[PDB]
A paper describes a structure:
[name] ([name]) plays a vital role in regulating thiol metabolism and preserving oxygen homeostasis in humans by oxidizing the sulfur of cysteamine and N-terminal cysteine-containing proteins to their corresponding sulfinic acids using O2 as a cosubstrate. Among all thiol dioxygenases, [name] stands out for its broader spectrum of substrates. It is the only enzyme of this protein family that oxidizes both small-molecule and protein substrates. Hence, in addition to regulating thiol metabolism, [name] initiates a transduction cascade, signaling hypoxia and preserving oxygen homeostasis in humans. pmcThiol dioxygenases constitute a family of nonheme iron enzymes containing a ferrous iron center coordinated by three histidine residues.
Herein, we report the first crystal structure of human [name] at a resolution of 1.78 Å with a nickel-bound metal center. Crystallization was achieved through both metal substitution and [name]/[name] double mutations. In order to obtain hADO with a homogeneous metal center and prevent oxidation via the iron center, hADO cell culture was grown with minimal media supplemented with NiSO4 during induction of hADO expression. Most of the polypeptide residues are observed except the N-terminal tag, residues 22–40 and 230–239. Despite the flexibility, the core of the hADO structure is a “jelly roll” β-barrel that supports a catalytic center. The structure of hADO shows a metal ion octahedrally coordinated by three histidine residues and three water molecules, which is a typical ligand scaffold for thiol dioxygenases. The protein-derived ligands are His112 and His114 from Loop 3 and His193 from β6. The metal center of [name] sits in a tunnel formed by the β-barrel. Instead, residues 137–144 of Loop 4 intrude into the catalytic center of an adjacent, crystallographic symmetry-related molecule, forming interactions with residues at the active site entrance. Additionally, extra electron density was found in the active site cavity, which was best fitted with a glycerol molecule from the cryoprotectant.
Author numbering: 3 to 22, 40 to 230, 239 to 270
The structure:
Amino acid sequence: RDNMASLIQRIARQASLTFREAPMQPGFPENLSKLKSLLTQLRAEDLNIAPRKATLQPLPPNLPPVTYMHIYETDGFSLGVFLLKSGTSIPLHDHPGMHGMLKVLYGTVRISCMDKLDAGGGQRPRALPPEQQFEPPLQPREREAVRPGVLRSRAEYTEASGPCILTPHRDNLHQIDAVEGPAAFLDILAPPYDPDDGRDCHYYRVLEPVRSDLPREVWLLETPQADDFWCEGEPYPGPKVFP
Ligand code: NI
């Protein structure tokens, strides 16, 4: 095709149309599928990002385990790249009210996908039974705050994998582990997080009871952002999204 914009410009345009008369323009399901088709095509070289290797030395507290390249954002969506060093994870977290789509650029990530049980989805979340104990033991305040959940999947993804999609009510919690070296992925979220307006990134831990196939029910506890987890910016080297 002549006169085609960069792939990342086209992804940004499509995300904007997806998330925000005659002839009728596409609706949301068509737009989301087109967005997924564009992400399926995206390669690290399309963003001028070369695959990284050999984060050879142990990671001191001075250095961020994960870095972030900002590409674009509107009120409707955010668009950027997360780059995980060898042996690091983005800990389990949610995306309140949000859709998400990500695409691995290089390396391998294990993505564990979960949900809190939602009575709007025909579930009946129970309270933690009193005789239920965990390792480490739960403070009584924590017992009241435990949420039943479901661990749906825990697969490994590479650049060959299709994009990974989440919705407000399905696969809305995920953890992302870098497997066998550094890894990176492009992430689209809609709407973007907004701490100032009560749309936060919440972290969770899965509790380990005292006394196995997926899906399986789990107990979840909201937890602060881990002391050793942070994610600082670095320059984005790819084609610029205009304006
Ligand atoms: Ni996420």
